[PDB]
Amino acid sequence: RPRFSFSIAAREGKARTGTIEMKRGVIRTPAFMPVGTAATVKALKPETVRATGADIILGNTYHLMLRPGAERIAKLGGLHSFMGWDRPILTDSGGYQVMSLSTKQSEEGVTFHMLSPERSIEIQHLLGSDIVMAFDECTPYPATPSRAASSMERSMRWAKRSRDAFDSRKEQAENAALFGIQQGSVFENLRQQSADALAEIGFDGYAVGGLAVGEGQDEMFRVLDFSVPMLPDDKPHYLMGVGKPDDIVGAVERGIDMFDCVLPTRSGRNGQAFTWDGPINIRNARFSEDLKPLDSECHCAVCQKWSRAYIHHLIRAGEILGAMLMTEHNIAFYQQLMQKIRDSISEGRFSQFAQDFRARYFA
């Protein structure tokens, strides 16, 4: 089992499919990562997360540093042992959540309590993270060229510090991997600058940051169109915070290999279930006596046993079992979507799938 090895087994247009091999397991790409804020994928046992098909989950550095604390988790044995997930875990750097949830921004780091590239990397280390994200700053939207160019440059300076900070910890540099994050809002030249700086520094994977921050899909794809190709080709492409079904498909078409989103998890607890015929709000009075499963084709355990009527009942009653079932279904649905995407690329029919998917999903 190598530390980190990405191989592409099939392509079609900019879309790719393959695997990322790591010490804790193999990750099939394009991949969807369930989000594990607070050392738990909301409402699911790790085994249930694994059963839906997930090969890797995302853990948040911001939230865990506060509660229960990095050193503490490290003392208990690391995040994997703490939550009971023994497969790869990717941990965000915290830059995104800090400037979103709690601010004194300088060059050393950020204050809300100082969080610096150096500290971020150590935190991800104590957690026992498999894929460390470089500490950065997600530029808000909109953002004048100047602003977008300031954040980006500072980010790129943090990228270098993140890299060195990572390479100094012998046991970390040898067991985990490091991804750099490109920034630069919706500006072509800024994206390019960022890409070059990152490639110059060297990273195991490259994420596209600062998107899906409010610019809408059209814009996002447009930006993705020139940005993704800037990143090296023989390395994984990670689109951060993107997860609407339709978004994943388009991003994969444009070359993205990894996704992470709370939509599946959060949407579920609230009453939205994803189906191949588009989403549905199970709370609707029209499912009250519907004996059909959430989705007619879904292979998840929830769609094999319970009806929409039952789940409708659970959700309107505010029962925990309701959130459990909805969430298992949504994540399972997302993983089936990723499976259909990998398979279609391996067969050279991704283009048609993408087309058949949108027709039905939006019919």
Next chain:
Amino acid sequence: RPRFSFSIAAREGKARTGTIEMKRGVIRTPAFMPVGTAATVKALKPETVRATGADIILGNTYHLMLRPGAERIAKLGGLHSFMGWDRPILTDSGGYQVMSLSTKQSEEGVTFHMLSPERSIEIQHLLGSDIVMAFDECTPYPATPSRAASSMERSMRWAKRSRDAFDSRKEQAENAALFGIQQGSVFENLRQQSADALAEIGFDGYAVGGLAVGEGQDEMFRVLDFSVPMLPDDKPHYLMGVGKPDDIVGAVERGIDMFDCVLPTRSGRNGQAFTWDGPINIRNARFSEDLKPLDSECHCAVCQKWSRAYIHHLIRAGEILGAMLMTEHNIAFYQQLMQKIRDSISEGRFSQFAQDFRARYFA
């Protein structure tokens, strides 16, 4: 598979152990019944409920009639299919919950919307219930002899109507069982009257109602001491709403065969975990870094994988996984307790177990 057959395989003092065979499954007695208010045992999949060892769960008639509705559940296929539990389900009559949650009391029934012995039995029928409880009135505490004697008499009149109402539905009388409920507060003569009236009417099992309503353990045992022996011996004895660990033990000593309680479920979601060394509030700051399981001997899946520190973290953070794990552990603990009780009675050492249990549980 018979409709309802109770057999005692071992005894010691007033304690008994045996099985209750029904069409949907065998029930090992003394038995503990997880409470399923709203067609779901809070935070658990039916399989997980079964995994803890439960042979039967209790469903509430009051709550289900309101939401989602009896006829509706019957239309979807019955409670078993609706929630995904194919084993026996005992359904309370609703008398208890009506005069507790929402009142116009007469002889025909109760108004809060009329709920009558006749309607109660039909509701339990539409639900597809295996053990139907007679519709009754749980006398509040305290209660002057006169009051306690009024409720009781009316209850006993309802017992008769419940019985006939039950025997008229050919397919119900042939597949389900009917329990009568003794009432009479803490008064010996009233309890006796009730017992005779019930035995005169004839029932498949007898429950002891109106206890654990605020009289405290000492009083409850005292009342149980003369009340339990009044009920027939070759039939199951059901103590309603009793579940504190120590309470179950004492009641079994006094002849009780069946228990139902929310303590396990509700207590869990709130932060209390049962251990053989007494309960603990996992929220306490002293478990923050405790790598030991909830209980050192518990065989449940939760105690096999996660630590008190992790669960401590989940509960303080208000995470759903926290309630899931705590609840699975508590119900599993209750079932292990029942297993230890059945085994000790089968070996003639229940007395010593009861003694060893209290010494440690309260040390």
